[PDB]
Amino acid sequence: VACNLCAVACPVGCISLQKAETKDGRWYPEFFRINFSRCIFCGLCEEACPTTAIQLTPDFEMGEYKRQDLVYEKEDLLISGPGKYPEYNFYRMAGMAIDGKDKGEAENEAKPIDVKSLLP
Amino acid sequence: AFELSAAEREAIEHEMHHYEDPRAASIEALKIVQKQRGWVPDGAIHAIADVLGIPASDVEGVATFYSQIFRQPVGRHVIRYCDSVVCHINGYQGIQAALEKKLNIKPGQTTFDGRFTLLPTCCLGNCDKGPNMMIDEDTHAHLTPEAIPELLERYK
Amino acid sequence: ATIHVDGKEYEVNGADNLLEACLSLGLDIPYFCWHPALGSVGACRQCAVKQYQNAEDTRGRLVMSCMTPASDGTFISIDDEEAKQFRESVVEWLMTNHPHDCPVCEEGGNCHLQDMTVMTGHSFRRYRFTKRTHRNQDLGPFISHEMNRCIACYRCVRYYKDYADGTDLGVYGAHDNVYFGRPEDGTLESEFSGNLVEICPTGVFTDKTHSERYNRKWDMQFAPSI
Amino acid sequence: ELAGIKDAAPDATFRIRGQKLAREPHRYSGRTAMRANISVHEPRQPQDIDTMFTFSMEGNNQPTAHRSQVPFAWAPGWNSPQAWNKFQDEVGGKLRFGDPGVRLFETSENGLDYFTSVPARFQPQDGKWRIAPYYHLFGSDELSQRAPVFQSRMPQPYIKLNPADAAKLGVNAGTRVSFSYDGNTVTLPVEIAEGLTAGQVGLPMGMSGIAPVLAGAHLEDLKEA
Amino acid sequence: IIRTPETHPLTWRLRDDKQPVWLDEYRSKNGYEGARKALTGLSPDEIVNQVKDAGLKGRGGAGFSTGLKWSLMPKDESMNIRYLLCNADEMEPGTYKDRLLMEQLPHLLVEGMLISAFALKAYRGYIFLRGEYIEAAVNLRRAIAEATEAGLLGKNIMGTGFDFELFVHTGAGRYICGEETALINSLEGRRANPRSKPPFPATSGAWGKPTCVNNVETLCNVPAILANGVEWYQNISKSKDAGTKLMGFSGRVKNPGLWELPFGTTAREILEDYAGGMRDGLKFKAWQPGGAGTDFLTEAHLDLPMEFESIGKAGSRLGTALAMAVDHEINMVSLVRNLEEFFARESCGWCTPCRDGLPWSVKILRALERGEGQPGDIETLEQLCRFLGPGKTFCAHAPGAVEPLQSAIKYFREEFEAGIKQPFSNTHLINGIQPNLLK
Numbered sequence A: 001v002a003c004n005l006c007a008v009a010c011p012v013g014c015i016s017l018q019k020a021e022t023k024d025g026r027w028y029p030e031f032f033r034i035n036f037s038r039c040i041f042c043g044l045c046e047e048a049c050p051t052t053a054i055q056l057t058p059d060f061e062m063g064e065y066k067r068q069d070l071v072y073e074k075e076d077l078l079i080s081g082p083g084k085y086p087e088y089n090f091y092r093m094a095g096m097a098i099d100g101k102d103k104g105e106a107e108n109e110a111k112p113i114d115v116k117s118l119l120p
Numbered sequence B: 001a002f003e004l005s006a007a008e009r010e011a012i013e014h015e016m017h018h019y020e021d022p023r024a025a026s027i028e029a030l031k032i033v034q035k036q037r038g039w040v041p042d043g044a045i046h047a048i049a050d051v052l053g054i055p056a057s058d059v060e061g062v063a064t065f066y067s068q069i070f071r072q073p074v075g076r077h078v079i080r081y082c083d084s085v086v087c088h089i090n091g092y093q094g095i096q097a098a099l100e101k102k103l104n105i106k107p108g109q110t111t112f113d114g115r116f117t118l119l120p121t122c123c124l125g126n127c128d129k130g131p132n133m134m135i136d137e138d139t140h141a142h143l144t145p146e147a148i149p150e151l152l153e154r155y156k
Numbered sequence C: 001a002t003i004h005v006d007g008k009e010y011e012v013n014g015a016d017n018l019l020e021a022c023l024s025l026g027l028d029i030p031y032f033c034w035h036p037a038l039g040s041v042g043a044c045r046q047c048a049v050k051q052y053q054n055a056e057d058t059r060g061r062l063v064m065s066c067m068t069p070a071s072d073g074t075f076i077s078i079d080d081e082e083a084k085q086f087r088e089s090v091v092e093w094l095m096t097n098h099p100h101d102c103p104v105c106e107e108g109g110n111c112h113l114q115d116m117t118v119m120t121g122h123s124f125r126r127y128r129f130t131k132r133t134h135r136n137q138d139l140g141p142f143i144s145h146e147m148n149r150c151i152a153c154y155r156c157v158r159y160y161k162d163y164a165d166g167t168d169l170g171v172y173g174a175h176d177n178v179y180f181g182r183p184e185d186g187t188l189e190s191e192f193s194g195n196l197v198e199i200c201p202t203g204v205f206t207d208k209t210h211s212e213r214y215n216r217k218w219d220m221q222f223a224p225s226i
Numbered sequence D: 001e002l003a004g005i006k007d008a009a010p011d012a013t014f015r016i017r018g019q020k021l022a023r024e025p026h027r028y029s030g031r032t033a034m035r036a037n038i039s040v041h042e043p044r045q046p047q048d049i050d051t052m053f054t055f056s057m058e059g060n061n062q063p064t065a066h067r068s069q070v071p072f073a074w075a076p077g078w079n080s081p082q083a084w085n086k087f088q089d090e091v092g093g094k095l096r097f098g099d100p101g102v103r104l105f106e107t108s109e110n111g112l113d114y115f116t117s118v119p120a121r122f123q124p125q126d127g128k129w130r131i132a133p134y135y136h137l138f139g140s141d142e143l144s145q146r147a148p149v150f151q152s153r154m155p156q157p158y159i160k161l162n163p164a165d166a167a168k169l170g171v172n173a174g175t176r177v178s179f180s181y182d183g184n185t186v187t188l189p190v191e192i193a194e195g196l197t198a199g200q201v202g203l204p205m206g207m208s209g210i211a212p213v214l215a216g217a218h219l220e221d222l223k224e225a
Numbered sequence E: 001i002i003r004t005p006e007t008h009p010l011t012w013r014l015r016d017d018k019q020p021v022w023l024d025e026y027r028s029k030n031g032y033e034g035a036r037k038a039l040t041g042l043s044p045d046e047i048v049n050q051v052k053d054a055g056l057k058g059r060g061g062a063g064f065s066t067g068l069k070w071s072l073m074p075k076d077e078s079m080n081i082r083y084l085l086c087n088a089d090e091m092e093p094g095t096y097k098d099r100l101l102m103e104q105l106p107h108l109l110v111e112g113m114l115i116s117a118f119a120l121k122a123y124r125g126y127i128f129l130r131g132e133y134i135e136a137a138v139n140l141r142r143a144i145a146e147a148t149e150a151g152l153l154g155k156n157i158m159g160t161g162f163d164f165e166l167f168v169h170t171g172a173g174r175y176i177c178g179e180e181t182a183l184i185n186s187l188e189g190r191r192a193n194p195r196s197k198p199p200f201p202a203t204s205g206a207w208g209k210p211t212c213v214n215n216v217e218t219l220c221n222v223p224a225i226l227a228n229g230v231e232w233y234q235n236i237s238k239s240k241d242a243g244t245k246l247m248g249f250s251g252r253v254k255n256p257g258l259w260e261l262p263f264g265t266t267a268r269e270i271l272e273d274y275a276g277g278m279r280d281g282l283k284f285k286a287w288q289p290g291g292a293g294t295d296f297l298t299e300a301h302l303d304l305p306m307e308f309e310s311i312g313k314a315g316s317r318l319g320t321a322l323a324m325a326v327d328h329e330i331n332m333v334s335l336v337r338n339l340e341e342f343f344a345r346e347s348c349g350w351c352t353p354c355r356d357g358l359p360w361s362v363k364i365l366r367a368l369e370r371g372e373g374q375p376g377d378i379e380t381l382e383q384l385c386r387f388l389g390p391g392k393t394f395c396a397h398a399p400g401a402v403e404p405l406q407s408a409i410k411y412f413r414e415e416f417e418a419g420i421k422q423p424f425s426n427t428h429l430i431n432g433i434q435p436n437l438l439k
């Protein structure tokens, strides 16, 4: 959701991202880049993610010929599935309305009562 | 849109004569509009605000603060059953169940013909003669569930 | 004037209240509804401190520091256990209806409600029931509206009406269903409506121009300009 | 006459216990990745020889620091706009060591003479239209009206007409009339202004095509297009 | 019950057919004689001091001295604009005294407001009446018209040069409007949020002017004092509270009603000798002395004189002195759930503890009703009782809201603990994350 918690929790400062929004109101990263020539693979970004989006995976084979190609962008990081956390969805928790989830449709959320309602 | 009639406007000005601040007549202005039209529509807020000389946010806040000023359309008759503690002891719940069974509606909504709107209400000040109900201007006491269809048929 | 906060003597102005006097001395008291430019109304009930009748008093009573004057010879305690529990309880009551919205909220890292939640020491939720929801309005191209995040601190209506003399923003409803905003969707008509983004301690009124290309406060490069 | 601008802010050699003034917060993020799309080699930190500030977090932003220029308000435990409480000597008052900026001139010991040039009354002359300025908080300022977020907030361009003047011109509200100023016949829609005095047309100053130099000037051949 | 003017100053004029008493019948039964005495032979300060040493306390439910409240109006002569407000709201569940007072004796209230406005030098008076007392509003307007026709109201009353205009402000149905500062705000046409005191309404009340707010029963007690003298009033009863209070007993009793009794009358005297005891098949379980806002008391407290001090030291409040009886058939948790639902929906929303903690108590009691309670719920209820006490909220709505909850926990804890069945659970399991099993 491009909340920038992983970028500030990084002690190296090797996460850069910008928040974009869809027409239905869903936050997402416009870009997401990680300098893997700088990353110490400490997992503080995964520890700081409130949506469990960023995840350190059991894979070490990452050697590169040029240092410029160690800057992974969003096309090199975004995978086709949920990874190590298979069921968590942040937008079900959140009270912000996005596509397919209106006000009062989140978990532990009541339906919105208008102030013009006849009930006391 | 909305237009205030001559009688409503005249009554509102006569109410404004009774106070040293015209803002004090907002509750009675909303009551006048509700008495004439059954409820307070959205244009009535701006008409009352223009008449009294106060902002429409103040009028809307007043109309939404009080529970007896209706900002949604209601039925022709407003049933208000008391659900307070003394009427809870005297058995308001059987009366409420009879009202649901006869009207086929939950509290807070209107029947299919727009005849009745059922509403829970605060203590009606008639606790020694409970349980109590209040249709539009008439209060009924000593309620029994067998008397609810007899009471509701006399309001057309 | 002379006050004694937790056994420490301070010289203050007797024409000020205890909240502004203690904040001027660097002492930390949580507060929502009081603003330096608006005054004290005693709404959020958050600024509670324990006041004693004299030096040789142990019982005391919980009073609002924003509503209590900083008169001479005034004995108060901020770090008292009962006052701390009451302030944490106020934050806990505000946290019952608050949406799980901090990552997708433009006030994150700039939020006064977050600061006062952390300062009171409240991080455990024993509330297991539902949270109330509100629909948003369209306030124009500058102010974004998100009424789920409101804590009913009444700062917006106080500033917009009693300070800025605006007419198109108010408070509606009653009990816990209090709604803050315009009677209908439309642009906020005041010329000083953008100060709501800093008057609001939560993320209800936010900068839409900043929300288009958003980044958090720690990620900014600031300069003092004119 | 501009000798006071030296004391508006201290010079570039000003330090707080030896270090400069931080522009960005201490928790500034993405230093090794915000420019990695261009070059993986991190560039040199920009140098600020003009001011006492630095283009990095390597500086001072303490609320008790002896300065008057505060780039942003942050105290530990106060990440909100309420950190200005920590940055003030008393809350809602002045800054801890004085507000920045100085007055260029003091109040003079002697006053001025009375302006005996009293103007005559406005006489509405036929065939000429006096231009009354209308100012907009969204549109009159040039740089502000260049902003794309103002374009929805800018009013649509107009010409204000008195009801008597509009009746004389035979135009209702909304219809488009043309008027020529320095050989530029520009057409605008009519808005009826009851409070505007007769013999005047109202124009939105600072807009696109309507300069603020037009205020107080006259108009010719105003007629319905 | 034999009703004499000396023993029953308020209800001795009541008709047997429950019909209202209009101007001719009221004046035949010694009406407006106290008003005549006060307006002709007495100074306003003399009447204020007379009411002050009569011991007339406020019958609205707080028991403040009415004469002391009258004396706190400023002595400044630039403030010649003054307001007298009659709190005819009566929105407390279990309170029906002012409905009886205004539906059948509106001229008593009119005379009392006339005397009190002469005493307070109040040029205007407003009867803030609720919107559901239609008959009381009709009778009050008719009595005001009758008194205006006979010269008891309007300009130059009784040739004394005193002008008093009395209006009837019909409410729009909120329980917070009975609070006197919220009453002032609702009279001003605003949202009925209360105001912080000091300043009190005596110094700056309605529209910033001096303003005195008094209940219907206090202003009904006033003309008896001004007609029969102070010495008659002090020797009505040998108790610390002077005069007669309208005390009743309601809720599944044989004769629910309302009777004018001297102070110090025991509650068992009201429940048995006047209400006829409980109905057949019902055993007495608890009672509330003065309405919904007061604490529950047990059958051991029935032998207690109904005074402010005696019920105060027993862990409750005298209140409106209209007791309500709870029998064994009614569950205590259901009753407290109903009370808290009323108190939470009648919150004005101004201040955080009531507005955001009364719904929490409502949800907890709803869970305890259907047996969905969890450990820590009763501890949470006790914490809400402690933290919603006097001085912790902006007004006294929430102390009255948490009085029945704390008393029912104190006396009927076995019913509350019977609703706790499931273990506590606030979280759900998230796959891939090990929970922190706190101890």
Ligand SMILES: NC(=O)C1=CN([C@@H]2O[C@H](COP(=O)(O)OP(=O)(O)OC[C@H]3O[C@@H](n4cnc5c(N)ncnc54)[C@H](O)[C@@H]3O)[C@@H](O)[C@H]2O)C=CC1
Pocket: E058, E060, E061, E062, E063, E064, E069, E072, E089, E090, E091, E092, E095, E178, E179, E180, E200, E201, E213, E290, E293, E317, E319, E320, E395, E396, E400
């Ligand atoms: N329908 C009813 O009759 C209801 C009655 N109540 C009762 O209302 C009471 C709570 O009401 P409050 O207004 O909070 O009571 P309170 O004790 O704060 O004040 C009551 C009266 O005393 C006056 N007063 C008190 N202290 C004063 C001072 N220091 N200086 C000047 N005037 C002073 C106030 O102006 C007011 O007229 C409770 O006893 C409750 O039982 C509550 C709900 C409904």
Ligand SMILES: Cc1cc2nc3c(=O)[nH]c(=O)nc-3n(C[C@H](O)[C@H](O)[C@H](O)COP(=O)(O)O)c2cc1C
Pocket: E057, E058, E059, E060, E061, E062, E063, E064, E065, E066, E087, E088, E089, E090, E091, E092, E175, E176, E177, E178, E179, E180, E213, E214, E215, E216, E218, E395, E396, E397
């Ligand atoms: C929440 C709340 C509601 C109240 N409602 C009423 C009411 O409906 N009628 C009334 O006379 N007093 C009510 N009071 C008490 C008033 O504050 C005040 O005591 C009364 O208007 C006048 O006081 P008196 O008894 O000395 O005449 C209420 C108090 C509170 C806190």
Ligand code: SF4
Pocket: A009, A010, A011, A012, A013, A014, A015, A034, A038, A039, A040, A041, A042, A043, A044, A045, A046
């Ligand atoms: S694992 Fe790498 S990217 Fe993540 S916080 Fe640590 S150094 Fe930064």
Ligand code: SF4
Pocket: A001, A002, A003, A004, A005, A006, A007, A017, A045, A048, A049, A050, A051, A052, A053, A054, C103
């Ligand atoms: S990866 Fe997680 S922590 Fe980082 S910006 Fe996205 S949602 Fe926030």
Ligand code: SF4
Pocket: C098, C099, C100, C101, C102, C105, C106, C107, C108, C109, C111, C112, C113, C114, C149, C201, C202, C203, C204
């Ligand atoms: S307003 Fe504050 S507490 Fe609420 S979601 Fe936004 S950042 Fe979080």
Ligand code: SF4
Pocket: C149, C150, C151, C152, C153, C154, C155, C156, C157, C180, C199, C200, C201, C202, C204, C205
């Ligand atoms: S919208 Fe913001 S400023 Fe207004 S009451 Fe709610 S939290 Fe306070």
Ligand code: SF4
Pocket: E176, E194, E346, E347, E348, E349, E350, E351, E352, E354, E355, E393, E394, E395, E396, E397, E398
């Ligand atoms: S306790 Fe607070 S929110 Fe509740 S009614 Fe009183 S002022 Fe309003």
Ligand code: FES
Pocket: B082, B083, B084, B085, B086, B087, B088, B122, B123, B124, B125, B126, B127, B130, B131, B132, E093, E094, E095
């Ligand atoms: S409790 Fe129902 S009328 Fe009072």
Ligand code: FES
Pocket: C019, C030, C031, C032, C033, C034, C041, C042, C043, C044, C045, C046, C047, C064, C065, C066, C067
């Ligand atoms: S800051 Fe004092 S109660 Fe809000």
